[PDB]
Structures are given as structure tokens and as C-alpha cells.
């Protein structure tokens, strides 16, 4: 009955079929593919066998259906996904440069996703929610923050746990309203999971150490740092440790952080200790980047176990 819930953008991704393919010339594209950091995160949670749900908004179109179908089939409680007739399901077109850099044409802010208001958050859907996960990338409007704030109040009310992944767009930091929202969340966060490049973003300090130790002082219980292709680290007032990255043929990093986080949250729900959870989250993130597609790199528990072993 205990459930892990997340909230945020759900969209489909349409990928360029060839590297170097431009946006301003006819070509071949592949998709749609289920996507959206919160959706990818929750999909990893369900594939690990942990009952979960997601609060989102999609339009009444096939793009919205493919996401709902995928999540539902994978075991996710999809009741929290409202369908908006007068809106188009968010999307994202992506191309690849020879350098490895990606280019996107996003439609999220002015699509169904950016419609999610505090009213789409039903207290009845979060009754059995003991753990709520927030994606920084979701906070791009006041309506979004309200929904998130409402949900967090409801979950902490029933004694739930709050985790927060600051995977935002740096630009958002130059907006006072959104700047506060992020800090507001950080203050109510028990589990903080920034990537190496985001540790200082929400910190008054200038060094990762001070930043991490600062977070713990503020009230954060755990800080998990994803160091891209350099491993990751676990930080708690009582302990501290790190694991190394696995050497893999990177193909698509789009959802490596979401998968890493899904594995961490789910593994911890399954009783794993911080050390086991960390190596698994790391292995999960590593396995994810090896497959093309935002949500096509998720893994089952023993696939992660085996990945680790064979290495």
C-alpha cells in the first residue's frame, strides 16, 4: 500500500535519425518515445518492483496515450495523469552533433505539461504516498510550484519523505520567483540528489564540501552526488563514501540521471543500505546511457546486479 509518487512533465521525444541532421531541412525522424524526467524516473521505480504513481498532465492525443500506456503497462499507477482536451501533449525534437552535443526544439512550457495546476493534485491520490520525488526541471511556472507545494504538504502531513533532484535549466536561477521555489523545496527536502554540476547551484558556498556540509546543516538528511562518468557519492552526517563509474559506450545520456535516481529511491525502499543502493544507482545510470531513447535504458534489479558482477 506504501507508494512512491513523483510529479511533473510527461512528453514524447522525436529523434533525428542521423547525426548532424538539421531542424531546418526535411529528413527522417524516429518516435514518438515516452519521455519527461519525472516519467523516466517513475518508470525506473516501477521496473524495480516498487509500487508508485505520478501526477502529470497530457493532452487527449496519441502522444499522450503512448506515455500512459507505457507507464501503466510497466506497473505505474497512472490515475494521477489528467488528460487535457484543449491542450497538446508536450514534445521535444532532438538532434545529435558530431561533438556529442544535443539540440532540442521543446514544447513543454506552453503545452499540456505547463498546465499542471495545484488542482490536478488530488489528496486522495497521495493517501498512501510515503515518499515524494521532485524534479527541478518541473519548476518553470508558478502554477507548477503550487502543485508541488500542495503535494509536499500532503505527503509530509502523513509523515512521508521528500527527495529532490535539482536537474533544472540554469536560466531558471535568473528568475527570482523560480529561484525561491527551488530553495523552498530544498528546505523541505530530506534526500538531495544533485549531479556534480549542480551541487553549488542552490548553495551560498563556493566549494562542493561546504555546499554538501551546508545542506546537511540546513536539515537535509542525505545528499547523493551523481558525478557523470566519474562515479557518485553518498553524504550523511554519520558517514560518507563514493563509488567509481563503470566504463560504458555512451549513446544517450538524456535519462541517465533520472534512472540513477529511480534506482536509488527504489533500492532504498527495498531495504538496501546506502552502500548497496549507491553502487546499484550507479550501475543503473551506467546501463541507461548505453541505449538510445529517453526511457529505453531502464533496468530490472537483477540486470543491474549482473551488470555489476560481470564487471
Amino acid at each position: 500500500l506504501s507508494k512512491v509518487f513523483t510529479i511533473g512533465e510527461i512528453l514524447v521525444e522525436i529523434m533525428a535519425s542521423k547525426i548532424g541532421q538539421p531542424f531546418d531541412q526535411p529528413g527522417i525522424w524516429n518516435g514518438p518515445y515516452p519521455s519527461g524526467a519525472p516519467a523516466i524516473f517513475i518508470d525506473q521505480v516501477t521496473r524495480l518492483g516498487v509500487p508508485c504513481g505520478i501526477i502529470s498532465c497530457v493532452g487527449n492525443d496519441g502522444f499522450g496515450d503512448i506515455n500512459i500506456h507505457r507507464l501503466a503497462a510497466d506497473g505505474v499507477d497512472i490515475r494521477g495523469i489528467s488528460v487535457l482536451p484543449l491542450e497538446a501533449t508536450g514534445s521535444a525534437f532532438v538532434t545529435y552533433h558530431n561533438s556529442g552535443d544535443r539540440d532540442f526544439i521543446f514544447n513543454i512550457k506552453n503545452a499540456a505539461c505547463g498546465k499542471l495546476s495545484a488542482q490536478h493534485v488530488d489528496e486522495n491520490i497521495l493517501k498512501d504516498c510515503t515518499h515524494f520525488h521532485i524534479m527541478g526541471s518541473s519548476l518553470f511556472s508558478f502554477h507548477m510550484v503550487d502543485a508541488v507545494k500542495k503535494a509536499v504538504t500532503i505527503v509530509k502531513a502523513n509523515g512521508g519523505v521528500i527527495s529532490f533532484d535539482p536537474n533544472i535549466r540554469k536560466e531558471m536561477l535568473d528568475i527570482p520567483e523560480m529561484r525561491d521555489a527551488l530553495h523552498f523545496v530544498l528546505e523541505l527536502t530530506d534526500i538531495y540528489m544533485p549531479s556534480e554540476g549542480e551541487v553549488l547551484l542552490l548553495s551560498p558556498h563556493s566549494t562542493p564540501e561546504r555546499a554538501i556540509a551546508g545542506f546537511l546543516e540546513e536539515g537535509v538528511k542525505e545528499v547523493i552526488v551523481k558525478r557523470g562518468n566519474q562515479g557518485a557519492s553518498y553524504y550523511s552526517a554519520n558517514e560518507q563514501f563514493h563509488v567509481e563509474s563503470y566504463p560504458v559506450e555512451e549513446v544517450d545520456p538524456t535519462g541517465a540521471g533520472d534512472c540513477f535516481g529511480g534506482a536509488w529511491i527504489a533500492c532504498r525502499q527495498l531495504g538496501f543500505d546506502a552502500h548497496r543502493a549507491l553502487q546499484y544507482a550507479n550501475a543503473c545510470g551506467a546501463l541507461a546511457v548505453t541505449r538510445r531513447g529517453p526511457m529505453e535504458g531502464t533496468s530490472r534489479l537483477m540486470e543491474i546486479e549482473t551488470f555489476i558482477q560481470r564487471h
Copy 2:
């Protein structure tokens, strides 16, 4: 003597296979320049008539493919505003035997307003064409109203193609906007199925007659595979349809209109203009792609001769 239009500019993404669904991973072709006003204006420039368009796109590749196509074809694109915070509109389509996923209303093209209509850009506009499909929001209506009145007050001619989605007729504000345009229309170009839409009359003969009496000077009726007709107080005549393998009619009606307007600008009498329009429309349907079916004068005349 310049022709202008206004409205949605977007890119179309096409399913690679017939029967291909929107909810399964597949292969798609695109983007392809699209949007009724853009298709219409492209056909105009390709026939050698100076023209321009007023629209809004995003600061992205989808916005660029449209601007570049029109510019390279000779269209005056100074009227196309680029909106940094908006995504250029798009449309995914799949066939059967038809179905779409549209992002227009809440996209860049849906932000077009009176503010984006520069009276100065229309200073030398002698003919302004309105696509009914463009009237989907108060702001779009305000843009159209400002543009039409400027041109009308400057002695220009107004053409109007009611290529609307029947839905809009159930919305009073949009219903009233369509009448606004009709009220100031000189050349009305409804397809056979749109003839009675803006008329209080129940029969087409009576409707057409009503439009001429209300102020319209010319009514051109697009009858798809049944040819087309021309109606004015001075005369009435019809042409038969050209039998052709129809592949995609998404822009056939736009090309027809573009041909009629451009040809009249070139000095064609009503009969010759109707013949080229009819032929231009026939040629457009034979190809897949919104704007991939526009033709140049040589093609239209070569097609005609062969028949």
C-alpha cells in the same frame, strides 16, 4: 501592386506508412513548410506576382525552414515576426484508406495579434487574402481586422477563403469574426461544402445570390472533383474537373486560390483565371506534402495543353 496574406505558418511531420499510429514508435518524414496562408502565398510568388505575409514563428529550425522557403521563392518575409519564447507551430499527420496532432493555437503562430501588424508593411498592398482557418483566437481576429481595414481603407481588394473547421461556427465570437471578413470581402472563394456556412439561405443558388447582393463582387466555388464555378453580377460560368490521382489535398485548395488571385493580378479574364486555378489545383493533389504541390506557370500551361 502587391498581394499579402496573414495567418498560421507551421511545419508538417508526415507518417512514413499508411495506417501508421500516433501512439507507437515509428518513422516520420519532415519537417515540411506548411500552413494555409503560407501555401497560398507560395503559389502566388511562384507565378511571378509580388507578395508578402504576416505571421509569427519561433526562433527555431522549424521557423527557419518556413522563412527560408518563402524568402527563396520570392515572398516578402518582413512581416514574419520571430518569437523567442514560442515554439513554431507544427502538425503530425497520418493516413488511412486523415488524422492530425496539432500544435497551432498554443504555439507561436497562435500569438499573432494587432501588435504584429505593421501598417507600414501594408502601405503598397493592393490585395489582401484571408484564410478562414486562421481565425481561432481573439488575438488572431484582431490582427486580421486591423490588416483588412488598413488595406480596405487604402482602396485595396479583399479575398476570403472560408477554409474553416466547422467547430469554430459554434463559437459566437469566431462566428461573428467570419462575418466581419465576409462583410468586407470583394472576392469570396468557398468550397462547395462551405457555401452555406455564412449564409442565412438554405440553398447554394440563393446563398451565392445573397453574397453578391450583400456586397461581394465575385464568388468562386471550388468543387473538388466536380470542377469549379465563377459568379459575378455580370456573369456566371463553370469548368469541369481534371481527372488525376489524388495523393494529398491538404494544400490543393490553397494552390487553387493562390492561382486564381495571382492570375487575375497578371491580367487574366475570369474564364482564363478559372482554368489555370482549376489546373493548378489538379496538379497540387497529385503530390504528398503541404507546399510540395505548388506549380509555376509553365507547369500549369503544359498540364492544360495535354488535356
